[PDB]
């Protein structure tokens, strides 16, 4: 590839990843203006490139913010995963009387491969559905648990 | 605390985390039915607890799926962060002619503290706005970059 081709495919890679993430506050984020020279109404091959490199560097701050937000969600999901595991030990300890079903570890492995095999719209939808069904299940359980 | 109180506060902790994450496919997710004994129409202190422990264990599979999805988004955001850094080196190397502005590292540290200090609705909104402004900025830049 050449210079303009590596630029094109590198930007195409970044743009695809942004769409994968997307599924009052008066903040100043870099935008493209007419005087910046990136328009046909005054196209400057150098003035535009100065604005591009400047805007991306001024955008690089908010990219670190996004990684902190998505890491917080990763730490959030891992916390719900472990807090449920403790909730199992709490309930079985209070029971102490066991007709208990435990899922098959290899059946779960076959399901996780199938859940992640479908495309991104189905997986974003699956993530959307799992959250609602589990919260509704806990609210129904907690209500009956408080009646004791 | 007592037995029923530790159950209540542990579930309250899990339910809060699920709402923090929430901002065709025919999947079988555990639900609460009338015969399960968790309703007033037939309330069984033991039959309900058997369904609770069973449903949560059968839910524990889909909790591992959620952690894989949010980790994928964390790896996705970190990839956009590093791919932009390479895009800077690509553009400056093609320029080679420098009236370049580089942001202040401590000014960015003051902003990141303020961006994360606001509540979750503002931060989910800020995450929403940063993604749109950066993709629109790249599409405007790439268009002018292809005209060269």
């Amino acid at each position: 590839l050449t210079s303009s081709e590596r630029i094109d495919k590198q930007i195409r890679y970044i743009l695809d990843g942004i769409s994968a993430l997307r599924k009052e506050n008066n903040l100043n984020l870099p935008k493209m203006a007419e005087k910046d020279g990136c328009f046909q109404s005054g196209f400057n091959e150098e003035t535009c490139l100065v604005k591009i490199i400047t805007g991306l560097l001024e955008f690089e701050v908010y990219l670190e913010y996004l990684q902190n937000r998505f890491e917080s969600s990763e730490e959030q999901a891992r916390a719900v995963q472990m807090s449920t595991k403790v909730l199992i030990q709490f309930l079985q300890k209070k029971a102490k009387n066991d007709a208990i079903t435990t899922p098959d570890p290899t059946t779960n492995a076959s399901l996780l491969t199938k859940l992640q095999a479908q495309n991104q719209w189905l997986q974003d939808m699956t993530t959307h559905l799992i959250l609602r069904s589990f919260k509704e299940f806990l609210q129904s359980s907690l209500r009956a648990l408080r009646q004791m | 605390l007592t037995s029923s109180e530790r159950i209540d506060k542990q579930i309250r902790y899990i339910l809060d985390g699920i709402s923090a994450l929430r901002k065709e496919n025919n999947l079988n997710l555990p639900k609460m039915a009338e015969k399960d004994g968790c309703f007033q129409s037939g309330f069984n202190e033991e039959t309900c607890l058997v369904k609770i422990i069973t449903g949560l264990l059968e839910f524990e599979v889909y909790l591992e799926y959620l952690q894989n999805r949010f980790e994928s988004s964390e790896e996705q955001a970190r990839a956009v962060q590093m791919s932009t850094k390479v895009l800077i080196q690509f553009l400056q190397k093609k320029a080679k002619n420098d009236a370049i502005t580089t942001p202040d590292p401590t000014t960015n540290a003051s902003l990141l503290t303020k961006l994360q200090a606001q509540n979750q609705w503002l931060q989910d909104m800020t995450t929403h706005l940063i993604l749109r402004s950066f993709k629109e900025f790249l599409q405007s830049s790439l268009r002018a970059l292809r005209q060269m």
Epitope: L1, T2, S4, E5, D8, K9, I11, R12, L15, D16, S19, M32, C38, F39, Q40, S41 | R132, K135, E136, L138, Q139, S140, L142, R143, R146, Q147, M148
Partner: antibody, heavy 124, light 108 residues
Framework: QITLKESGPALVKPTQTLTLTCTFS??????????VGWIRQPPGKALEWLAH???????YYNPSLKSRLTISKDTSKNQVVLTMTNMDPVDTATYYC????????????????WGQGTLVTVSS | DVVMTQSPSSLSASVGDRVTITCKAS??????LTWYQQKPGKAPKLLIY???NRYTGVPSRFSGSGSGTDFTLTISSLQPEDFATYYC?????????FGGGTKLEIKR
């Protein structure tokens, strides 16, 4: 459902204004990476790209016809208008408007949605 | 600014035959090239995008290839349904120039 439909006169006198209007439905021209272009085809001839307008009003034209070409948009009515003045019989053609979407991504299909096309005859 | 040239301008093949249509660019447009199929009078129908990636619904017998300045559209086993004119468009830089088009005729 995505629909683009051209509207305009089927007959224009020589040296008289031609006003074409493309009305679309199913997408917003204010969406990032979205754009609408104009392409014409003289009877039995090859295609010729005319003009294009992007979401940020950065208008582009074919360099040969920019003198008589003015494109503009109204995102509140979903309308893109291409205006040709001082029409000549050489510019009689079927005029299409097409949708360009997801410009920089791997889903830049190109002109993936077209209209039926309006046959424009120029004669007194 | 950019000139696309197609060869041949016309072609005639049998049913079940293979068709080869080429398109050249005056300057590199990377893989950002798009093929269209046009029936008489009707608006063009999208076939290939990004040189070698197939648009939704297009039969598997249509396959494009190439990059830079050499591009080729291939119809494996020709059906009589494929009677049309095939066009070549570069989407890299304005003007988004079309090719001359290749008129495909069916033999019998």
């Amino acid at each position: 459902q995505i629909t683009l439909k051209e509207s305009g006169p089927a007959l224009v006198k020589p040296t008289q204004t031609l006003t074409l209007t493309c009305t679309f439905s199913g997408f917003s021209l204010s969406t990032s990476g979205m754009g609408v272009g104009w392409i014409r085809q003289p009877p039995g001839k090859a295609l010729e790209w005319l003009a294009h307008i992007w979401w940020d009003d950065d208008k582009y034209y074919n360099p040969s016809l920019k003198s008589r070409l003015t494109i503009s948009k109204d995102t509140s009515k979903n309308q893109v208008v291409l205006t040709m003045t001082n029409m000549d019989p050489v510019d009689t053609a079927t005029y299409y408007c097409a949708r360009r979407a997801n410009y920089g991504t791997s889903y830049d299909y190109g002109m993936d949605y077209w209209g039926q096309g309006t046959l424009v005859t120029v004669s007194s | 600014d950019v000139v696309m040239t197609q060869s041949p301008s016309s072609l005639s093949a049998s049913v079940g035959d293979r068709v080869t249509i080429t398109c050249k660019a005056s300057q590199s447009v990377s893989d950002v090239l798009t093929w269209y199929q046009q029936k008489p009078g009707k608006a063009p129908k999208l076939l290939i995008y990004y040189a070698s990636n197939r648009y939704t619904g297009v039969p598997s017998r249509f396959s494009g290839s190439g990059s830079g300045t050499d591009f080729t559209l291939t119809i494996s086993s020709l059906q009589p349904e494929d009677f049309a004119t095939y066009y070549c468009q570069q989407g890299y830089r304005s003007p988004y120039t079309f090719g001359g088009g290749t008129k495909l005729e069916i033999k019998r």
